[PDB]
Design a binder for this molecule. Structure first.
Ligand SMILES: *C(=O)[C@@H]([C@@H]1N=C(C(=O)O)[C@H](S[C@@H]2CN[C@H](CNS(N)(=O)=O)C2)[C@@H]1C)[C@@H](C)O
Length: 233
Protein backbone atom coordinates (compact mmCIF):
# COMPACT_ATOMS: atom_id res chain seq x y z
CA UNK A 1 0.00 0.00 0.00
CA UNK A 2 1.15 3.53 -0.81
CA UNK A 3 1.46 6.12 1.95
CA UNK A 4 0.30 9.05 -0.19
CA UNK A 5 1.56 12.53 0.63
CA UNK A 6 0.93 15.23 -1.97
CA UNK A 7 0.72 18.60 -0.19
CA UNK A 8 3.88 19.81 -1.94
CA UNK A 9 2.17 19.65 -5.33
CA UNK A 10 -0.68 21.94 -4.24
CA UNK A 11 1.23 24.86 -2.70
CA UNK A 12 0.19 27.36 -5.37
CA UNK A 13 -3.14 25.87 -6.45
CA UNK A 14 -6.28 25.06 -4.50
CA UNK A 15 -6.94 21.44 -5.40
CA UNK A 16 -7.87 17.87 -4.61
CA UNK A 17 -6.46 14.44 -5.48
CA UNK A 18 -8.38 11.16 -5.35
CA UNK A 19 -6.63 7.85 -6.01
CA UNK A 20 -7.61 4.21 -5.55
CA UNK A 21 -5.95 0.91 -6.39
CA UNK A 22 -8.69 -1.22 -7.91
CA UNK A 23 -8.56 -3.82 -5.11
CA UNK A 24 -8.85 -1.15 -2.39
CA UNK A 25 -12.25 -0.62 -0.77
CA UNK A 26 -12.07 3.18 -0.71
CA UNK A 27 -10.02 5.90 -2.39
CA UNK A 28 -7.29 7.90 -0.71
CA UNK A 29 -8.24 11.58 -0.71
CA UNK A 30 -6.36 14.86 -0.43
CA UNK A 31 -8.69 17.79 0.37
CA UNK A 32 -11.91 15.88 1.08
CA UNK A 33 -14.03 19.03 0.98
CA UNK A 34 -13.22 19.74 -2.66
CA UNK A 35 -13.21 16.03 -3.56
CA UNK A 36 -16.94 15.75 -2.82
CA UNK A 37 -17.84 19.03 -4.57
CA UNK A 38 -19.36 18.67 -8.05
CA UNK A 39 -17.81 20.59 -10.93
CA UNK A 40 -18.60 20.88 -14.62
CA UNK A 41 -16.70 17.96 -16.23
CA UNK A 42 -15.48 20.07 -19.14
CA UNK A 43 -13.65 17.93 -21.70
CA UNK A 44 -13.45 14.97 -19.32
CA UNK A 45 -17.04 14.30 -20.40
CA UNK A 46 -15.59 13.03 -23.72
CA UNK A 47 -15.00 9.68 -21.95
CA UNK A 48 -18.73 9.20 -21.23
CA UNK A 49 -19.78 10.84 -24.51
CA UNK A 50 -17.64 8.37 -26.51
CA UNK A 51 -19.06 5.38 -24.63
CA UNK A 52 -22.60 6.59 -25.29
CA UNK A 53 -21.92 7.43 -28.93
CA UNK A 54 -20.60 3.93 -29.55
CA UNK A 55 -23.35 2.24 -27.55
CA UNK A 56 -26.13 4.07 -29.42
CA UNK A 57 -24.50 3.60 -32.83
CA UNK A 58 -24.10 7.36 -33.31
CA UNK A 59 -20.49 6.52 -34.19
CA UNK A 60 -19.07 3.28 -35.60
CA UNK A 61 -15.69 2.94 -33.88
CA UNK A 62 -12.58 4.91 -32.86
CA UNK A 63 -11.87 5.51 -36.57
CA UNK A 64 -15.23 7.07 -37.44
CA UNK A 65 -14.32 10.08 -39.59
CA UNK A 66 -16.25 13.33 -39.39
CA UNK A 67 -15.55 16.10 -41.87
CA UNK A 68 -14.49 19.58 -40.92
CA UNK A 69 -17.26 22.01 -41.87
CA UNK A 70 -14.82 24.69 -43.00
CA UNK A 71 -15.55 26.89 -40.00
CA UNK A 72 -12.34 28.36 -38.62
CA UNK A 73 -12.18 27.62 -34.93
CA UNK A 74 -9.87 28.81 -32.19
CA UNK A 75 -7.45 25.88 -32.24
CA UNK A 76 -5.80 25.29 -35.62
CA UNK A 77 -5.58 21.55 -35.11
CA UNK A 78 -9.37 21.43 -34.88
CA UNK A 79 -9.69 22.83 -38.40
CA UNK A 80 -9.39 19.50 -40.21
CA UNK A 81 -11.09 16.13 -40.43
CA UNK A 82 -11.08 14.06 -37.23
CA UNK A 83 -12.07 10.67 -35.87
CA UNK A 84 -13.66 9.67 -32.59
CA UNK A 85 -10.19 8.70 -31.38
CA UNK A 86 -8.22 11.68 -32.65
CA UNK A 87 -11.10 13.79 -31.30
CA UNK A 88 -10.48 12.51 -27.80
CA UNK A 89 -6.67 12.84 -27.99
CA UNK A 90 -6.89 16.40 -29.37
CA UNK A 91 -10.08 17.27 -27.44
CA UNK A 92 -11.91 18.28 -30.61
CA UNK A 93 -15.12 19.82 -29.31
CA UNK A 94 -16.93 20.12 -32.62
CA UNK A 95 -16.62 16.37 -33.24
CA UNK A 96 -18.10 15.51 -29.87
CA UNK A 97 -20.83 18.12 -30.25
CA UNK A 98 -21.87 16.60 -33.58
CA UNK A 99 -21.92 13.18 -31.91
CA UNK A 100 -23.97 14.50 -28.96
CA UNK A 101 -26.56 15.91 -31.36
CA UNK A 102 -26.81 12.51 -33.09
CA UNK A 103 -27.16 10.74 -29.75
CA UNK A 104 -29.97 13.15 -28.94
CA UNK A 105 -31.58 14.32 -25.71
CA UNK A 106 -33.54 11.17 -24.86
CA UNK A 107 -30.70 8.71 -25.27
CA UNK A 108 -28.13 11.02 -23.66
CA UNK A 109 -30.41 11.53 -20.71
CA UNK A 110 -30.92 7.82 -20.23
CA UNK A 111 -27.26 6.86 -20.40
CA UNK A 112 -26.02 9.72 -18.24
CA UNK A 113 -28.51 8.60 -15.59
CA UNK A 114 -27.64 4.92 -16.08
CA UNK A 115 -23.94 5.52 -15.37
CA UNK A 116 -24.71 7.86 -12.45
CA UNK A 117 -22.72 10.73 -13.90
CA UNK A 118 -22.83 13.32 -11.13
CA UNK A 119 -26.07 15.32 -11.04
CA UNK A 120 -27.00 13.84 -14.43
CA UNK A 121 -28.35 17.21 -15.58
CA UNK A 122 -28.04 17.78 -19.33
CA UNK A 123 -30.70 20.52 -19.53
CA UNK A 124 -27.98 23.04 -20.46
CA UNK A 125 -28.38 21.89 -24.07
CA UNK A 126 -27.59 18.69 -25.95
CA UNK A 127 -24.21 19.93 -27.26
CA UNK A 128 -23.42 22.38 -24.44
CA UNK A 129 -24.24 20.71 -21.14
CA UNK A 130 -20.72 19.57 -20.18
CA UNK A 131 -18.96 22.96 -20.49
CA UNK A 132 -19.38 25.14 -17.40
CA UNK A 133 -23.07 24.34 -17.65
CA UNK A 134 -25.72 22.23 -15.92
CA UNK A 135 -23.88 18.89 -15.64
CA UNK A 136 -21.54 18.57 -12.64
CA UNK A 137 -19.58 15.66 -11.16
CA UNK A 138 -17.26 15.38 -8.18
CA UNK A 139 -13.68 14.08 -8.23
CA UNK A 140 -14.84 11.17 -6.05
CA UNK A 141 -17.63 10.45 -8.57
CA UNK A 142 -15.16 10.56 -11.49
CA UNK A 143 -13.07 7.88 -9.77
CA UNK A 144 -16.16 5.74 -9.14
CA UNK A 145 -17.13 6.01 -12.82
CA UNK A 146 -13.62 5.37 -14.14
CA UNK A 147 -13.18 2.40 -11.78
CA UNK A 148 -16.25 0.86 -13.37
CA UNK A 149 -14.90 1.64 -16.85
CA UNK A 150 -11.59 0.02 -15.98
CA UNK A 151 -13.23 -3.05 -14.40
CA UNK A 152 -15.74 -3.19 -17.27
CA UNK A 153 -18.80 -3.17 -15.02
CA UNK A 154 -20.59 -0.21 -16.64
CA UNK A 155 -23.76 -1.16 -18.59
CA UNK A 156 -21.98 -0.74 -21.95
CA UNK A 157 -20.96 -3.48 -24.37
CA UNK A 158 -17.50 -4.82 -23.49
CA UNK A 159 -16.22 -3.90 -26.94
CA UNK A 160 -17.17 -0.25 -26.44
CA UNK A 161 -15.42 -0.02 -23.09
CA UNK A 162 -12.26 -1.55 -24.57
CA UNK A 163 -12.41 0.89 -27.49
CA UNK A 164 -12.74 3.93 -25.24
CA UNK A 165 -9.89 2.77 -22.99
CA UNK A 166 -7.63 2.43 -26.07
CA UNK A 167 -8.65 5.98 -27.07
CA UNK A 168 -7.59 7.21 -23.62
CA UNK A 169 -3.95 6.07 -23.79
CA UNK A 170 -1.82 9.05 -22.78
CA UNK A 171 1.61 7.65 -21.96
CA UNK A 172 3.25 4.36 -22.86
CA UNK A 173 6.22 3.22 -20.78
CA UNK A 174 8.10 -0.06 -20.31
CA UNK A 175 6.17 -0.98 -17.17
CA UNK A 176 3.11 1.26 -17.32
CA UNK A 177 0.34 2.74 -19.43
CA UNK A 178 -1.33 5.95 -18.34
CA UNK A 179 -4.92 6.47 -19.48
CA UNK A 180 -6.59 9.82 -19.01
CA UNK A 181 -8.24 13.01 -20.13
CA UNK A 182 -7.76 16.72 -19.38
CA UNK A 183 -10.51 19.25 -18.79
CA UNK A 184 -10.41 23.05 -18.64
CA UNK A 185 -12.75 26.01 -18.39
CA UNK A 186 -13.98 28.59 -15.87
CA UNK A 187 -10.86 27.95 -13.74
CA UNK A 188 -11.75 24.28 -13.30
CA UNK A 189 -8.74 22.12 -14.09
CA UNK A 190 -9.21 18.38 -14.45
CA UNK A 191 -7.08 15.37 -15.10
CA UNK A 192 -8.87 12.05 -14.67
CA UNK A 193 -7.95 8.51 -15.64
CA UNK A 194 -6.06 5.47 -14.47
CA UNK A 195 -2.57 4.08 -14.53
CA UNK A 196 -1.74 0.44 -15.04
CA UNK A 197 1.67 -0.31 -13.53
CA UNK A 198 2.69 -3.97 -13.58
CA UNK A 199 -0.04 -5.87 -11.70
CA UNK A 200 -1.49 -2.80 -9.97
CA UNK A 201 -3.99 -0.30 -11.40
CA UNK A 202 -4.74 3.08 -9.83
CA UNK A 203 -7.88 5.06 -10.66
CA UNK A 204 -7.38 8.80 -10.18
CA UNK A 205 -8.82 12.28 -10.36
CA UNK A 206 -7.03 15.60 -9.98
CA UNK A 207 -9.13 18.73 -9.76
CA UNK A 208 -7.80 22.24 -9.20
CA UNK A 209 -8.64 25.86 -9.42
CA UNK A 210 -6.59 26.24 -12.57
CA UNK A 211 -6.21 24.53 -15.94
CA UNK A 212 -6.31 20.97 -17.28
CA UNK A 213 -2.66 21.16 -18.29
CA UNK A 214 -1.75 22.21 -14.75
CA UNK A 215 -3.83 19.35 -13.34
CA UNK A 216 -2.13 16.89 -15.68
CA UNK A 217 1.29 18.17 -14.61
CA UNK A 218 0.44 17.76 -10.92
CA UNK A 219 -0.75 14.22 -11.69
CA UNK A 220 2.47 13.25 -13.46
CA UNK A 221 4.55 14.63 -10.58
CA UNK A 222 2.59 12.59 -8.02
CA UNK A 223 2.80 9.39 -10.08
CA UNK A 224 6.52 9.93 -10.60
CA UNK A 225 7.12 10.56 -6.89
CA UNK A 226 5.69 7.14 -6.19
CA UNK A 227 7.39 5.43 -9.13
CA UNK A 228 4.13 4.53 -10.89
CA UNK A 229 5.47 6.56 -13.78
CA UNK A 230 9.08 6.49 -14.93
CA UNK A 231 11.24 9.53 -14.35
CA UNK A 232 12.49 11.58 -17.30
CA UNK A 233 15.63 9.50 -17.78
C1 LIG B 1 -11.99 20.69 -22.56
O1 LIG B 1 -11.69 20.67 -21.39
C2 LIG B 1 -12.36 21.97 -23.27
C3 LIG B 1 -12.02 21.80 -24.75
N1 LIG B 1 -10.71 21.14 -24.77
C4 LIG B 1 -9.74 21.89 -25.09
C5 LIG B 1 -8.36 21.44 -25.25
O2 LIG B 1 -7.60 22.13 -25.95
O3 LIG B 1 -7.98 20.38 -24.70
C6 LIG B 1 -10.16 23.30 -25.28
S1 LIG B 1 -9.72 24.28 -23.86
C7 LIG B 1 -9.16 25.82 -24.52
C8 LIG B 1 -7.77 25.68 -25.15
N2 LIG B 1 -7.14 26.96 -24.87
C9 LIG B 1 -7.91 27.82 -24.00
C10 LIG B 1 -7.06 28.36 -22.85
N3 LIG B 1 -6.22 27.31 -22.30
S2 LIG B 1 -6.07 27.13 -20.71
N4 LIG B 1 -5.80 28.56 -20.05
O4 LIG B 1 -7.28 26.56 -20.17
O5 LIG B 1 -4.97 26.25 -20.45
C11 LIG B 1 -9.03 26.92 -23.48
C12 LIG B 1 -11.66 23.11 -25.48
C13 LIG B 1 -12.45 24.37 -25.14
C14 LIG B 1 -13.81 22.34 -22.94
C15 LIG B 1 -14.86 21.59 -23.74
O6 LIG B 1 -14.06 22.14 -21.54
Amino acid sequence: SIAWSVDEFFKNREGTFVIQEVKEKSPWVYNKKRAKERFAPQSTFKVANALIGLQTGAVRDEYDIKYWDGVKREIDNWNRDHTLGSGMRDSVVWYYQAMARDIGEERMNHWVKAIHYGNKDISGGIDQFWLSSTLRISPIEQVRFLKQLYEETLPFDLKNMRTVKRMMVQEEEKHATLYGKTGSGSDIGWYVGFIKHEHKTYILATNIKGTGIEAKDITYRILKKYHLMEASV
